[PDB]
Design a protein around this ligand. Structure first.
Ligand SMILES: O=[N+]([O-])c1ccc(O)cc1[N+](=O)[O-]
Ligand SMILES: O=[N+]([O-])c1ccc(O)cc1[N+](=O)[O-]
Ligand SMILES: [Mg+2]
Ligand SMILES: [Mg+2]
Lengths: 127, 127
């Protein structure tokens, strides 16, 4: 595809959450542009490139026991960007916990994620 | 205050929604830096400065019949920024309607909104 339309952004961002929810690290990485950046949480320096991004998702999702679901609709733009609210459920030293997040994404002219910014801070974590 | 902490960002952004919900145009404008920008929706060129911002809110809220409420928690950063999901309820040619929005804000070193970006597109509008 080219620069995704608003409807395509909504589909791609929902697909991303699906891949996080099942923990398909390789499929997530494929959604990113080869030189994409991730800022997690927003406020921290970006990581760069598919290998660093793969390392990120392997760390976050490789231990298993992670689920993610949209908590409301994707809000898309007409310039290939969008924002979405979701909750990540995991386990903290064996206890269930949740993290509320908003991701902002910009897609490139091939429909790949160029930038991801994950807004959250520690008070978005609940035990 | 100085650059708001994560907790202060959560308070300021929730306060903003409160002021939108009651329609206090003057109090909203006061939350913005004198030279702030608003991008509504994200993808459109910014408006600039408190007068243009006041004109924006007078247009959006001056006709009355607008409510706004968070639909989930504010996601704040440690660098004075945050993102929040909310729903705006209004009336379209006399019929109830809703718009789902995510605002991203950056605050300045005085606790005023420097930039606001409102993510939404037409399929976030429901009649
Ligand atoms: O660190 N996180 O929990 C996180 C934040 C934003 C995301 O898009 C995905 C994840 N994750 O893979 O879990
Ligand atoms: O255009 N809008 O509905 C809108 C979008 C983002 C906002 O922070 C506020 C409003 N509003 O005043 O209604
Ligand atoms: Mg490229
Ligand atoms: Mg200033």
């Amino acid at each position: 595809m080219n620069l995704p339309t608003a409807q395509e952004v909504q589909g791609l961002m929902a697909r991303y959450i699906e891949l996080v929810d099942v923990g398909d690290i390789e499929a997530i990485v494929q959604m990113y542009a080869d030189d994409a950046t991730v800022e997690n949480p927003f406020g921290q320096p970006p990581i760069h490139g598919r290998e660093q991004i793969a390392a990120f998702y392997r760390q976050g999702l490789g231990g298993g026991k992670v689920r993610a679901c949209l908590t409301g609709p994707v809000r898309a733009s007409h310039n290939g960007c969008g924002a979405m609210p979701f909750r990540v459920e995991m386990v903290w030293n064996g206890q269930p916990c949740a993290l509320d997040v908003i991701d902002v994404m910009r897609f490139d002219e091939h429909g790949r994620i160029q930038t991801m910014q994950a807004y959250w801070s520690e008070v978005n974590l609940s035990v």
